[PDB]
Design a protein around this ligand. Sequence first.
Ligand code: LMT
Ligand code: LMT
Lengths: 265, 264, 264, 264, 266, 264, 264
Amino acid sequence: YDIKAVKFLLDVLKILIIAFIGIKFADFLIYRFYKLYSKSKIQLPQRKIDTLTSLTKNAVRYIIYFLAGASILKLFNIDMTSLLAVAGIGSLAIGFGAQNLVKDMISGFFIIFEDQFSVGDYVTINGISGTVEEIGLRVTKIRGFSDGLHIIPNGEIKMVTNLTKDSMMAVVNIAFPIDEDVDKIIEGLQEICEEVKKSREGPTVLGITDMQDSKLVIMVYAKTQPMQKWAVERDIRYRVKKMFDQKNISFPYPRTTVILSEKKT
Amino acid sequence: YDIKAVKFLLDVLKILIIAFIGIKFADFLIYRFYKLYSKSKIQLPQRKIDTLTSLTKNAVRYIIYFLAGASILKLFNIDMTSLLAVAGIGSLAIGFGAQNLVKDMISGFFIIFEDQFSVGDYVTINGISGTVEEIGLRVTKIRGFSDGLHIIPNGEIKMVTNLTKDSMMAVVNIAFPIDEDVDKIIEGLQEICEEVKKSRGPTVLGITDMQDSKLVIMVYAKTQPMQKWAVERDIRYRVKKMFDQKNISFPYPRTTVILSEKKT
Amino acid sequence: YDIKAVKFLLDVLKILIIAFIGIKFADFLIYRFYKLYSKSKIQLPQRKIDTLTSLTKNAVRYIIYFLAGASILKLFNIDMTSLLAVAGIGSLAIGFGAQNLVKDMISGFFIIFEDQFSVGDYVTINGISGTVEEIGLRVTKIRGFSDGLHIIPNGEIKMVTNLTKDSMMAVVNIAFPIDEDVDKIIEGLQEICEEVKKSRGPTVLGITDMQDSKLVIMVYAKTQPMQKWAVERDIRYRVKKMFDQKNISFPYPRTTVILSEKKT
Amino acid sequence: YDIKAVKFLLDVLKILIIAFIGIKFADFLIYRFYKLYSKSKIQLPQRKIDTLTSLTKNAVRYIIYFLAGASILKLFNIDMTSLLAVAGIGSLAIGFGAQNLVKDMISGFFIIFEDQFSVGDYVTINGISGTVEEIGLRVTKIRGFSDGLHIIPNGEIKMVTNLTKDSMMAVVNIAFPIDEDVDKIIEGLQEICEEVKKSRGPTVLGITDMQDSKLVIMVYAKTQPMQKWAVERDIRYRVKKMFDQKNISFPYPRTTVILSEKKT
Amino acid sequence: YDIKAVKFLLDVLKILIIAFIGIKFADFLIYRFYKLYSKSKIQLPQRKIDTLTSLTKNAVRYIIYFLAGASILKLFNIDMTSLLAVAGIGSLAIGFGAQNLVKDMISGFFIIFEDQFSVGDYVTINGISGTVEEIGLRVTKIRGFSDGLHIIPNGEIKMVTNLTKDSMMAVVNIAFPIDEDVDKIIEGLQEICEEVKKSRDEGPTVLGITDMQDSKLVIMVYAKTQPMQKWAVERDIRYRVKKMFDQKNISFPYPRTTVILSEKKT
Amino acid sequence: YDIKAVKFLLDVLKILIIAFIGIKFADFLIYRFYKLYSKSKIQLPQRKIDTLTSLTKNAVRYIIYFLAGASILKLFNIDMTSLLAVAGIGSLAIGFGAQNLVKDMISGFFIIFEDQFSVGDYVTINGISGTVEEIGLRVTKIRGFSDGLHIIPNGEIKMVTNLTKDSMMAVVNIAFPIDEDVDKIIEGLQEICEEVKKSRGPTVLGITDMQDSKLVIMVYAKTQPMQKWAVERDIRYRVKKMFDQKNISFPYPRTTVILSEKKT
Amino acid sequence: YDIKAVKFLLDVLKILIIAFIGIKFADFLIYRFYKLYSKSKIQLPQRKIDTLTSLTKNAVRYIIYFLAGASILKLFNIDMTSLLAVAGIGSLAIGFGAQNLVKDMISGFFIIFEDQFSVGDYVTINGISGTVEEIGLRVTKIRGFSDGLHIIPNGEIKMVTNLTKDSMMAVVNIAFPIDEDVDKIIEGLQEICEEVKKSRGPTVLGITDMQDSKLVIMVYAKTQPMQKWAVERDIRYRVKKMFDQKNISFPYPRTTVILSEKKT
Ligand SMILES: CCCCCCCCCCCCO[C@@H]1O[C@H](CO)[C@@H](O[C@H]2O[C@H](CO)[C@@H](O)[C@H](O)[C@H]2O)[C@H](O)[C@H]1O
Ligand SMILES: CCCCCCCCCCCCO[C@@H]1O[C@H](CO)[C@@H](O[C@H]2O[C@H](CO)[C@@H](O)[C@H](O)[C@H]2O)[C@H](O)[C@H]1O
């Protein structure tokens, strides 16, 4: 009948009493981390935080059941490495699945901690531009106009270009025919920058920026206060159109030279 | 004949009795997690949940068989690290295979918990736009019109743009010839915004783009959720008729050509 | 000469007898999992299931040989962590190789368990559309017409759009010249929807797009599963004939040219 | 001088004798797995299988040397976890490198075991089409005509579309001007299907697409494996001649131009 | 009643006292790594470094609670490998999540340590060009003109091309009609290089006809220019080429199409 | 003062003497693996193999220093798992870094062992075509003409299409106007195949494609390895001259225009 | 009060003294690996190597602090596997972060050791072409003309094509109208190769492509390293002048139009 059979009992006992203490203690701490976020009603409708509370309860129960079971099993001569080879299917699947969640959060943490963009400026993130409306630490929300509300997981942000930082820059690339008088148009554009400066950096006439088949491209650019940009550009375009009509300068219509051939069928 | 030969027996015994208790206990808990989801008939046809029940039964049997066998093997001087190097081929294959499933679920969990889109709005998810019909936590189902029902694993969602949140925005980019009177057309579009406001933006933002023979002015209006593409169509019809009445010429591509005196 | 030299023998002995029992037991269980799937001839030609039986036999032999060998090696003072560092080259290679297989299967499991598509509807899976012919749990087979039979491993399915669920939707985007009378054509299309309704939507949604010399009005109709592309063709024929009777001019591109006085 | 110094010797001894037994035994088994595949000359030129034999020899030598050395080191108080941290650089590098090889093989195993394609049909695998010439379990070889012999590692196969299964399908999309009589052409194509049926589908499916100046009607026919592109060519020749006899005008783009009075 | 029951107590005791010493010691070191970066006010508004301080506090509390708890559990016969199979879900999730952060940092470390680009030159990084404004070790900030301020995590930099190193190079590809006199234009461009050399900033030179197309012919002029002098030189050269085209009366590279006329109807 | 203090010394001693033996033995084996590859001067300039020799020396030194230090540390009550958590940063970094090297090598091993391409044929590997000049087992070198010498790591090879195996195939797709006599041209091409056969396929496969104003007939011929592009050029010249003699009109795009009476 | 309380002290003592010896010894070795690279001033400004020295100091301090702390913790009954689950968050993050660095270096090591390109030739690496200026083992620096200095981490090199190895190859694809005399132009190009050979290939390979209104003959020549793009320009100038003298008409697109009698 041996002498250990009592010690053994002390062992399965130790596991049971520790697991019990554990459950009750967890239920306590959870009911407290509950008490707080619940009684103040700072954020989060109840319907959700209840689902989240039972989420945590369930998680901790399953963990405790698993540890106590595994331990008792050890007590009956079951090999824990083999058990590891089973349980680790889930260590691996959950661990690697959750990695992305951790990524999003670290990402968000920096976005915020480094004030990459404040809860209101107009940015472009991953070829998607819009005005930032919300900045959680798992997701940034950005609504472009005409485009919808984009919800973007912070981890996916590979680069965030901010459009409205230390100001903004407006550009217009005007196109003329090379079959055209350069100095007259550069003069006209000069006069347009002149006039625009008069209604509240630039705007200036940078040289002929590109030379093409039948066209010739001169850009005007101006440094503008945050957001006044696309507006400035539209002002400038209207100005260029009217200037084209008054100075009677011919338009950049593509043109062909054609050679005729004497044949039939 | 030694003294351990009885202890040894106690050990292979301990494994067998614990694995037996284990099986019966699992059969019990499974027949209970069965009893519940089965007797209430809340969801899921039986034909399926039966397949799923035998799934869990089989899984638990294989796990138990493996643990008990491995343990007995240990009892006969078989090295458990080597065993691990065998069994882990499966730990790794299953573990990393299942990772994606875990991903889908965490994904869905947030989509729901963060009300990213309600079981009814019109969204666009990975270059695919449609009306959300179902939101499980493993899959979102979205049917675009003319396009079919799309079933998208929640994990694949890299971004979800919602089109019908705090409202919507309608745009029309009208194109004219530069060989054209700007103020007359901008005046006409002004009159069209005027008129459209009258039936329950819309505004004329400047010339937004300047091209070879064209010139492009956009009108835009903030619209209640979904009235959007509709507003746009209203505005288009209006612009067509306005073009006919004001007799403004159309944005046909215009080429200017030069003739050459040759032969062959 | 010591005292253990007998115990040692008991240990190498324990390994050998357990490995022997193991082999014979495995051969048994395999000859049984054989007996079943073999004597009923439910599926799978013999030539294959024989190759698959010897596959399982060989695997189990190699695993047993490896575990027994590794254990005996342990008995001669060979370090099992170093052995692990060797054997795990294969644990890793096989484990990560097989992960994909496990992926395909979980994937298939859901496709079926969730009736994503039945053994007969017309779906599109990864930019490839066709009629589903077979649905295993490792591979879906889909044959498009004119396109061949596609065998797609279930894991590769990133999204599966079903075209024939709660019905279908037919669209036709009719193109006119903007140099054209809108209301006459919209009237004609109205008459065509009218007439098509009469043979067992279809409706005129506004001008959906406005281009350089064109203008685009869509007609759309909700159709029973598969009657779709058919409806569309009916509607096209109708629109062509309507264009001929109403004598409406065709959406030919149009260019206005300006002539220039030069030479060479 | 102690009492263990003899036991220690028994231990370094045990390792040496086991490693020696191991080497000799491996050299034996290798010379046997050699004897077989060598004396029958079933496949593989000698020059190669020699290189492969010394490959196995060397592999086994290095593994044995490493295990014996590591074990002796353990005997001199060298920590085996630290050793693992060294040796695992190679465990990881080899393990993960070889993963792809394991992938190719599992992949090939299924391609074969599931008769996805027989050693002779015309398939398309990863946007590359051709006739399968060889099917190993690590590589499929496919030669398109005019295109060269493609050797594709089985693992890279993400999808395999078979073109010559339960038959084949031939299509021809005929293009007409919309400025054209529909029923005359549809009648002519009817007559062409009629005539083609007579030489050992083919049917006129409606107007499948409507474009700027064109209109597209497709004819299609179910054909025996490979007779396909051939049927299509027959049908094309027929359609050309039919165009010449029925004198129907060709689908040349057409543009309408407007002339403008200007200068420079 | 046994004899160990006192030793056991010594063990749970040992854990508790070590964990307590640990907490207090960490609070100390944290309050010191605090004292420094805080009292000098070298960088970082307080509002942030407070959030960061409580971050480190909380981290270390959770780690200590977990270690002590796990160790007591071990004391009550709880298997630590099974525990590992639970806790490693987090080992793996955090570890692999944080990998990217470590990447960014090693990346930045080299960018800086190798002076790949100084806090002022004009670079192009991942198809995105601009002037570098800030170089942290986690992020490079680059503002293109007309383009906005780009904040790029250092890890994402797969290649960094610098445009303003040992100088710069200006190019202009001039296009003519093949229906044209080559030597007259090559002569004119020669005269333009000549004249541009005369206004201050290697080149500019007339490299041969670099490309031949349907109705066009393309001759490039190029010049080595001091850092940033570049796009400017190019614009000078373009203006010069336009005016040269007007004076030398050379005809423009308009696309040209020969047409053949056909006698038909409908 | 205790009794172990001498045993302890025996332990740090055992580590030091084993590590010393280790170093000297490694220096030996390295100076031998040196002696061989060095005195025969089979390949590799000295300047390199010297750098490689000191590489191996240094590696082995660092490994030995680390093992012995780690072991002594263990002797002073330092925990080896925590050590592992440090040292494994490097285990992981080096192990996963080197994985690609192992990949390249296994890859090259098969390329060679399977004679996928001999040190001289013209292949295309990853959208890059050229003549193979060198085949190492870590890198294949291929020089296309006009294109430069490409050095490609063997691991990056996802597919290798060989162009010059069991021969080659030459294709020419001749384009005519549909506004054209089919049989006259097919006749002419017949005569060209006839004539080309006469100088040491080629055949007229039907009209392989039908387009807006064009019609495309292909001729194809099976040619000895490399004579291919050459054959094609022969055939093209032939087709041009045949076009000139048979006076057949060229496949110029043709557009029918409609004229409109307007202004501005 | 027990008997161990002194041994325990010996243990925490052992850790402290070994850690102290450890620190001092590391400070020494670091101050030596400092002494060398510092007093010779071979490379690296001081400002940097100082930052790098304190880097190594700090690294070693943190590792030592962590090992000693972990070990004392172990002494107070703290479980080391739990500790590992904590500390390995960093093992994994650092280990996998640094993997890329290890990759770059192995990569560079081969680039150099295999003289893939010398500190001076013109190469193209990942669709980016330029002259190599520097070759470190972590980064290759290449400056294209007009393009800037590219700094490329060696690990990112997937393929390196060298343009200036065993020489170079120059190509010019001349385009003519098919409406043209082939033999006259092929004759002229022959004369141009003739003349170019005269100033220190070049050959007329057949008509390499046949298009709608064009026809393309390539001339090619094998040229000394770098003389290539230059040769090509010579050849182009020659072809233009040859076109002017032989009066051959230019490859202008040509379109045949058909006129239609309509209105609006
Ligand atoms: C969760 C705790 C935090 C992570 C701690 C990581 C510290 C860094 C340690 C790197 C040591 C690498 O050393 C490596 O160990 C692993 C153990 O998984 C062994 O891996 C071996 O056994 C496993 C068992 O599951 C097999 O599935 C695997 O295929 C096989 O290679 C390698 O053969 C060995 O080379
Ligand atoms: C093969 C294994 C590969 C392992 C790779 C090793 C990873 C480390 C890569 C470089 C990390 C960045 O290097 C970073 O430099 C700064 C100095 O600018 C260090 O900063 C250091 O000096 C500063 C003074 O300003 C102190 O505040 C700090 O206590 C100290 O650590 C950072 O602590 C270090 O993180």
